[PDB]
C-alpha cells in the first residue's frame, strides 16, 4: 500500500505544479530585446600545465584564480601579469576539483583518493603546506566550496554530501537521498541554502541549517554534471548530458525554461553566470563554449580555440573576465 | 616599467615554470598502467609478486622503465563517471581467476562469476574511452583451475563447450572466449598470460606487453604504422 | 622562523670579513635576502639583495663593488664578503627575508644583528625629529619623498617600520593599504603620493620606539631619517 502511496504522492506533486503555473516563461519574455551579438576576445593565455586541466575556482578579488590538473599540481595564478603565484605539489594526481577560499586564505582540492586537502596560504614559513585531510569519504570527491574558512561542503561519489568542520576535522551535518553520484554543487550568496545535482536526473535543494532536503526537482532526462546559482539566490540554471540546460525557480518550485539546438548532441561540462545574471555561460563537449540569454534563450556568442574538451568554466565575481578550462592544458581569459 | 616586486613576481614564476617543466619531463618517461578485476580475482597477490580507500598506486621499476600501477578496486561509485579520467593510459592490466566458473557470485547467487567477468571486460573493451589502449589479461589460480577441472567439469555451467576434459583444451578455450569479446581486433592487442607462483615471468610478461604498446606509439608519432 | 648572524667583533681597516646567517624554521630557498646596516647615532641603511637561485643582485652606489654577497641554498647559510672596509663601515648588519609575489608581505622578519666596529635616488625626508606624546592621545607622523610612489599598477610602494630600542625592528604597515601579520589595529596609514600620515590610536608604551619610512620603487633603497617618540 505505501508503494503505491508513494506513486499517488507523486501523481498530486505533479498536479500542483500543474495547477501553478499558469503563464510560460518564454511568452512573458518575449517583451524584452535581444541582447545582440556578443564578442568576446581572449586577453590571457595561461600555460604552465601539462596534463589535462579539470576544474578552476576564482578568487573574491577578481585577480588570482586557482587550476587544478593531472601533473600533481595545484597552481594558484596572477589573472593580470600572468604570473604564477603558487604551485602546490598534490599527493594523489587524480583531482577532480578544486575550491579557492572567500578570505583567500585556504585552497581545497579533491578527487578519486578521497580525500578532500586543505592547503593554508598564509603561512609565516613560505611553503603551502597541507593543514588538514577530511576522510570518511566512501566514493570520489567530485565537487567543493568554502562556506567559511571552518566550513566546507564537499560532494562525493557514495551519494552522501557532508558539511566538515576543518578546526575539528570531523563532519558535522550528512545530506543523504540521492540515487547514484552527485557530480557537482554550488554555493548560494547567502550561503545558508546550496542544492546539488545527482545522476539521477534530479537536483534537491538542501539547508545547512536544517540538515534536511528542501525542494526536489526531476526535469532531467539522464544526469546532471553542473548546477549553478543565480546571483538573487533563487534560481539555477543545470548544465546535463542531453544537450539542454534548464533553469528552476525555487519559489515556484517548477522548471522556467529550457535551453536546447538540435545540432549540438553533447553534454554540458560546466555553467555559470554573469554579476547581473542576464548571460548564461556553458561548457559543452564540442569544444566550443556557447553563451545564451537568461530572458530570450537565444545564443549572444560562441566561444572557440580550446584545442580538447572544455572541463569546465567560471565567470569571477565582479563579472570583469570570464576564463575558461579545457583539456587542453590552457586556461584563456575572455572579457 | 615594472616595479622592483613585479620583476621578483615574473622571476618567481620564471623559477615556478623551470620546476615544472622539469617535473613534466619527469612524468612523461613513467609508464602508467590501470589494474582492473574482480576483488577476489588475486590483485593483492599479482601486486605483491610484481613489487618483489580511493586509488592505490604501486612504483617499481623494472629495465630502466618506471611503471605505474593504479588499483581502483576500493571504490564502490558508478564507473562510468570517473572512466574518462584513465583516457592516457599506456596498457590495461585486467585479472581475473580462472577457478571462478565453480564458485557462484555472493550477491544473490544467481549468475555464475566467470559470466560477470565476461561482462567485466566487455564494457572495458568496448568503452569509447579506450579505443587504442592495450588489455593485458592476467589468468589466476591455475593450478585450483588444474584440481577444479580434474574433480569437476566445465560443461555444467554452460553446455555449449563440448570439448574433451583437459586442462590444456579448457584453459585455452577459456583463453578463446576472452579473446573473442574484443571487437576492434586491428587497433588494440589482448596479451594473455597465465600467472603462477613464479615472481620472474609476470614481471616480464608485463615489461613486452608495455614495451610492444611503446613501439606502436613511436611508429604512430614517426607515421609509419 | 629564526635568523641569527655570525662573525662580528673588531676588523681592522682595510682588511677583510665574512659573515654567515643561518637560516631555521622556514624554506629558505624561496626567499628572497636583504642586509640593512645601522650606525650607532644614525638611522638604517639598505646594503645589498640577492634574489631566490641567485638569479639578479643589486647593491647600493656607495658599496658597489667592496662587498660581495652570495648564498648556499643546500645549506641554508647566507655570505656576505667584504674586501677593503673603510671607516664609515661601523655598523650592525640585519638580515631579512623578502618573498615576492602578489599579496605578499616583505620585510617582514628581521634578523638580530652583528656588531662590526672598525677603528682608524628618491630621498626620503622625515620632516619631524621627535616628537614628545602621551599615552592615549592620537600621534600623527609624516614622511615625505623625492618621488612620486605611485606606480601605475596602483600599488604605493611605501613600508612603515618600527625599531623598539634594544630589539630588533618589525614591519607594521606594508604598502600603505595593508597591516602586516601581527600588528594590532592601532597602527593605520593613509595619505597620498609625496605626502604620507602615519596615525597611532590608543598610544601604548611598547608603540614608543623609532619610525621608519622606506620607498620600494626603485633600487638602491634609500630609507628614512627616523622619527623617535618619547614619553
Known amino acids: 500500500q505505501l508503494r503505491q502511496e508513494a506513486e499517488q504522492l507523486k501523481n498530486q506533486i505533479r498536479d500542483a505544479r500543474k495547477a501553478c503555473a499558469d503563464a510560460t516563461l518564454s511568452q512573458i519574455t518575449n517583451n524584452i530585446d535581444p541582447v545582440g551579438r556578443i564578442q568576446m576576445r581572449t586577453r590571457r593565455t595561461l600555460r604552465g600545465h601539462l596534463a589535462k586541466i579539470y576544474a578552476m575556482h576564482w578568487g573574491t578579488d577578481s585577480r588570482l584564480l586557482v587550476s587544478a590538473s593531472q601533473d600533481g599540481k595545484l597552481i594558484i595564478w596572477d589573472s593580470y601579469t600572468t604570473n604564477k603565484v603558487h604551485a602546490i605539489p598534490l599527493r594523489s594526481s587524480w583531482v577532480m576539483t578544486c575550491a579557492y577560499a572567500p578570505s583567500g586564505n585556504y585552497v581545497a582540492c579533491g578527487g578519486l583518493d578521497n580525500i578532500c586537502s586543505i592547503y593554508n596560504l598564509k603561512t609565516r614559513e613560505g611553503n603551502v603546506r597541507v593543514s588538514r585531510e577530511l576522510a570518511g569519504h566512501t566514493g570520489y570527491l567530485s565537487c567543493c566550496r568554502f562556506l567559511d574558512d571552518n566550513q566546507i561542503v564537499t560532494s562525493s561519489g557514495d551519494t552522501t554530501c557532508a558539511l566538515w568542520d576543518i578546526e575539528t576535522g570531523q563532519q558535522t551535518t550528512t545530506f543523504t537521498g540521492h540515487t547514484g553520484d552527485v557530480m557537482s554543487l554550488s554555493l548560494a550568496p547567502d550561503t545558508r541554502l546550496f542544492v546539488s545535482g545527482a545522476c539521477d536526473a534530479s537536483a534537491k535543494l538542501w539547508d545547512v541549517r536544517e540538515g534536511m532536503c528542501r525542494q526536489t526537482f526531476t526535469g532531467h532526462e539522464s544526469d546532471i554534471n553542473a548546477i549553478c546559482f543565480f546571483p538573487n539566490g533563487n534560481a539555477f540554471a543545470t548544465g546535463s548530458d542531453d544537450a539542454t540546460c534548464r533553469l528552476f525557480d525555487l519559489r515556484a518550485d517548477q522548471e522556467l525554461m529550457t535551453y536546447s539546438h538540435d545540432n549540438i548532441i553533447c553534454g554540458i561540462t560546466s555553467v555559470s553566470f554573469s554579476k547581473s545574471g542576464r548571460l548564461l555561460l556553458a561548457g559543452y563537449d564540442d569544444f566550443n563554449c556557447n553563451v545564451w540569454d537568461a530572458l530570450k534563450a537565444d545564443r549572444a556568442g560562441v566561444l572557440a580555440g580550446h584545442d580538447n574538451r572544455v572541463s569546465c568554466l567560471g565567470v569571477t565575481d565582479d563579472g570583469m573576465a570570464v576564463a575558461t578550462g579545457s583539456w587542453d592544458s590552457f586556461l584563456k581569459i575572455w572579457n | 616599467t615594472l616595479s622592483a616586486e613585479d620583476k621578483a613576481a615574473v622571476e618567481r614564476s620564471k623559477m615556478i615554470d623551470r620546476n615544472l617543466r622539469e617535473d613534466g619531463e619527469k612524468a612523461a618517461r613513467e609508464v602508467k598502467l590501470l589494474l582492473l578485476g574482480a576483488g577476489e580475482s588475486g590483485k593483492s597477490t599479482i601486486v605483491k609478486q610484481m613489487k618483489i580507500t580511493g586509488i592505490v598506486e604501486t612504483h617499481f621499476t623494472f629495465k630502466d622503465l618506471h611503471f605505474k600501477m593504479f588499483d581502483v578496486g576500493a571504490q564502490r561509485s558508478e564507473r562510468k563517471k570517473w572512466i574518462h579520467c584513465f583516457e592516457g593510459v599506456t596498457a590495461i592490466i585486467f585479472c581475473v581467476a580462472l577457478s571462478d566458473y565453480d564458485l557462484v557470485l555472493a550477491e544473490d547467487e544467481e549468475m555464475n562469476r566467470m559470466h560477470e567477468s565476461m561482462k567485466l571486460f566487455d564494457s572495458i573493451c568496448n568503452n569509447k574511452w579506450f579505443t587504442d589502449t592495450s588489455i593485458i589479461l592476467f589468468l589466476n589460480k591455475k593450478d585450483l583451475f588444474e584440481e577444479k577441472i580434474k574433480k569437476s567439469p566445465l560443461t555444467i555451467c554452460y553446455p555449449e563447450y563440448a570439448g574433451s576434459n583437459t586442462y590444456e583444451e579448457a584453459a585455452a578455450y577459456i583463453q578463446c572466449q576472452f579473446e573473442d569479446l574484443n571487437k576492434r581486433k586491428d587497433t588494440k592487442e589482448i596479451y594473455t598470460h597465465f600467472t603462477c607462483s613464479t615472481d620472474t615471468k609476470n614481471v616480464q610478461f608485463v615489461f613486452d606487453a608495455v614495451t610492444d604498446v611503446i613501439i606502436k606509439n613511436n611508429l604512430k608519432d614517426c607515421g609509419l604504422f | 622562523v629564526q635568523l641569527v648572524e655570525s662573525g662580528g667583533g673588531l676588523v681592522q681597516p682595510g682588511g677583510s670579513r665574512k659573515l654567515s646567517c643561518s637560516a631555521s624554521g622556514f624554506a629558505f630557498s624561496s626567499f628572497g635576502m636583504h642586509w640593512v646596516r645601522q650606525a650607532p647615532e644614525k638611522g638604517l641603511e639598505w646594503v645589498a639583495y640577492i634574489s631566490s637561485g641567485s638569479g639578479t643582485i643589486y647593491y647600493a652606489d656607495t658599496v658597489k663593488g667592496r662587498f660581495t654577497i652570495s648564498r648556499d641554498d643546500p645549506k641554508n647559510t647566507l655570505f656576505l664578503q667584504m674586501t677593503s672596509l673603510r671607516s664609515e663601515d661601523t655598523a650592525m648588519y640585519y638580515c631579512?627575508?623578502?618573498?615576492?609575489?602578489?599579496?605578499?608581505?616583505?620585510?617582514?622578519?628581521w634578523g638580530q644583528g652583528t656588531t662590526l666596529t672598525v677603528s682608524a635616488d628618491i630621498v626620503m625626508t622625515q620632516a619631524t625629529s621627535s616628537v614628545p606624546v602621551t599615552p592615549g592621545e592620537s600621534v600623527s607622523i609624516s614622511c615625505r619623498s623625492s618621488?612620486?610612489?605611485?606606480?601605475?599598477?596602483?600599488?604605493?610602494?611605501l613600508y612603515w617600520f618600527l625599531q623598539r630600542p634594544g630589539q630588533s625592528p618589525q614591519l607594521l604597515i606594508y604598502?600603505?593599504?595593508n597591516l602586516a601579520s601581527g600588528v594590532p589595529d592601532r597602527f593605520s596609514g593613509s595619505g597620498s603620493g609625496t605626502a604620507f600620515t602615519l596615525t597611532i590610536s590608543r598610544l601604548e608604551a611598547e608603540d614608543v620606539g623609532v619610525y621608519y619610512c622606506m620607498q620600494h620603487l626603485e633600487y638602491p633603497l634609500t630609507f628614512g631619517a627616523g622619527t623617535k617618540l618619547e614619553l
Open positions: 631579512v627575508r623578502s618573498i615576492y609575489y602578489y599579496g605578499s608581505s616583505p620585510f617582514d622578519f
Open positions: 618621488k612620486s610612489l605611485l606606480h601605475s599598477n596602483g600599488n604605493t610602494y
Open positions: 604598502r600603505m593599504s
